[PDB]
A paper describes a structure:
In the present work, we focus on a class of monocyclic disulfide‐containing 19 amino acid peptides targeting the Vascular Endothelial Growth Factor‐A, the main pro‐angiogenic factor in Human. We proposed to use this peptide as a model to rationalize the thermodynamics of α‐helix stabilization by an i to i+4 lactam bridge.
The helix of peptide 4 c (KxxxE) was longer (residues P8 to P14) with a H‐bond network similar to peptide 2 c. In peptide 1 c, we also observed that the conformation of the lactam was compatible with a n→π* stabilizing interaction involving the linker amide carbonyl π* orbital and the Lys P10 main chain carbonyl n orbital, which was mentioned above. Interestingly the lactam bridge cyclization caused the side chains of residues P10 and P14 for peptide 1 c and 3 c to be in a non standard rotamer conformation, the consequence of which was moderate steric clashes involving hydrogen atoms. Therefore, lactam cyclization can result in sub‐optimal geometry with remaining steric constraints, where the side chains did not adopt the standard conformers (1 c and 3 c peptides). The real space correlation coefficient (RSCC) of the α‐helix was higher than 0.83 on VEGF:1 c, VEGF:2 c and VEGF:3 c structures, which supported these models. At this value, 1 c had 6 clusters, showing a larger flexibility in this segment than 2 c and 3 c, whereas 4 c and the monocyclic peptides had between 9 and 16 clusters. Bicyclic peptides 1 c, 2 c and 3 c had higher [θ]215 than the other peptides and ratios closer to 1, indicating that their C‐terminal α‐helices were mostly structured in unbound form. It corresponded to the mean Gibbs free energy gain due to the pre‐organization of bicyclic peptides 1 c, 2 c and 3 c compared to monocyclic analogs.
Numbering used by the authors:
A (entry chain W), C (entry chain V): 13 to 107
B (entry chain P): 1 to 14
């Protein structure tokens, strides 16, 4: 009934984690239109480092392409490819 | 036990 | 090579997801402390409702207890049990 220390420390240490990201956040110049879904799942560096002076940053990145819907009012439905940045590897590095 | 890398338990007990 | 629309949509939609949360955000009366690890993995609602009229919110919760290292000035390193709120169910409701 209690998660042991090493299991929590290892699971929370800096690594790529599935993160749900609003598309407007990735692409704030696109906030004029409406997307469906409005957010996408991306692998992004997350978690903590052994020390507050370190930050979890990507050391390998790639693009991932997804099928997304976009509309403008009183205007046709579109479906097309949209690309997003993913993090493939992360490490704890000085800030 | 360099701080840039994930640790083993020995790094904490000591 | 391209993630398909229905796969993106289902994976992005409001639901409990492993989220990395800083302990200070969960224990604001202990911001005098240093915790190891400094963040914990918790199940929390995330994702989108694909209606700007709606927000993703927890509808069922529980606790989980984890072993965390704790230190503060005039104290040495301790280990102790800390409880955290988890989200078991989420739904899209008006905002």
């Amino acid at each position: 009934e209690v998660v042991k220390f090493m299991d929590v420390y290892q699971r929370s240490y800096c690594h790529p984690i599935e993160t749900l990201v609003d598309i407007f956040q990735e692409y704030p110049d696109e906030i004029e239109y409406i997307f469906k879904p409005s957010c996408v799942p991306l692998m992004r560096c997350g978690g903590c480092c052994n020390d507050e002076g370190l930050e979890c940053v990507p050391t390998e990145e790639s693009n991932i392409t997804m099928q997304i819907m976009r509309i403008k009012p009183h205007q046709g439905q579109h479906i097309g490819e949209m690309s997003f940045l993913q993090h493939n590897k992360c490490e704890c590095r000085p800030k | 036990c360099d701080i840039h890398v994930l640790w083993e338990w020995k790094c904490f007990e000591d």
